[PDB]
Amino acid sequence: DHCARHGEKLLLFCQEDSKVICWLCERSQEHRGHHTFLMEEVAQEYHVKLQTALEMLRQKQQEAETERNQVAKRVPKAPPEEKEALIARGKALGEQTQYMRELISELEHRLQGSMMDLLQGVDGIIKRIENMTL
Ligand SMILES: [Zn+2]
Ligand SMILES: [Zn+2]
């Protein structure tokens, strides 16, 4: 809640860095030309954004899981090469679903947490979700 560098209240949010900082950090060279906001002034848009993302991710996950199940179902009836291909396919899908599970987990954590929980490093996860949807 307080800055380790300056001891002041961590109440500001930097748009370029997506970092939560104090007013003395904003005056540091590392935040030169950056635009800062009180965390209250930006919590809403990111709440909405992450909320929107979470839905999509959940949908994509359930789809991927059903697909994995179907792939698994084809395995026993398939000949050896196709078997192995299907096994690999299943594994890959598993990896994807694990990734989606991680992101979803993080999103719920952020959406149910404090503003600092919500905003600290949100740009990375937004990037990740953006890549995932692409
Ligand atoms: Zn500071
Ligand atoms: Zn900055």
Author numbering: 95 to 228
Q: What sentences appear in the manuscript?
A:
TRIM5α is a restriction factor that intercepts the incoming capsids of diverse retroviruses, including HIV-1, and inhibits viral replication. Like all TRIM proteins, TRIM5α consists of an N-terminal tripartite or RBCC motif (RING, B-box 2, and coiled-coil domains), followed by a C-terminal domain. Higher-order assembly of TRIM5α requires the B-box 2 domain, which is thought to mediate three-fold symmetric interactions that connect coiled-coil mediated TRIM5α dimers into a hexagonal net. We therefore engineered artificial constructs – which we call miniTRIMs – that retain the integrated B-box/coiled-coil fold of the full-length dimer but are more amenable to biochemical and structural analyses.
The dimer is quasi-equivalent to the trimer: the same sets of residues make the same interactions but with valence of two instead of three. Another distinction is that the first two turns of the coiled-coil helix are overwound and bent in the dimer form, which might indicate some structural communication between the interacting B-boxes and the coiled-coil domain. Interestingly, B-box dimerization is associated with local bending of the first two turns of the coiled-coil helix, as well as altered packing of the B-box against the coiled-coil domain. This suggests a potential mechanism of allosteric communication that can link B-box oligomerization and coiled-coil dynamics. In context of the full-length protein, assembly cooperativity drives the B-box into the trimer form, and so the B-box dimer might represent an intermediate state that can incorporate an additional B-box domain to form the trimer. In principle, however, B-box dimers provide a means for extending the TRIM array in regions where the local assembly environment disfavors trimers. The catalytically active RING configuration is more structurally compatible with a B-box dimer, and it is therefore possible that the B-box switches its oligomeric configuration to facilitate enzymatic function.
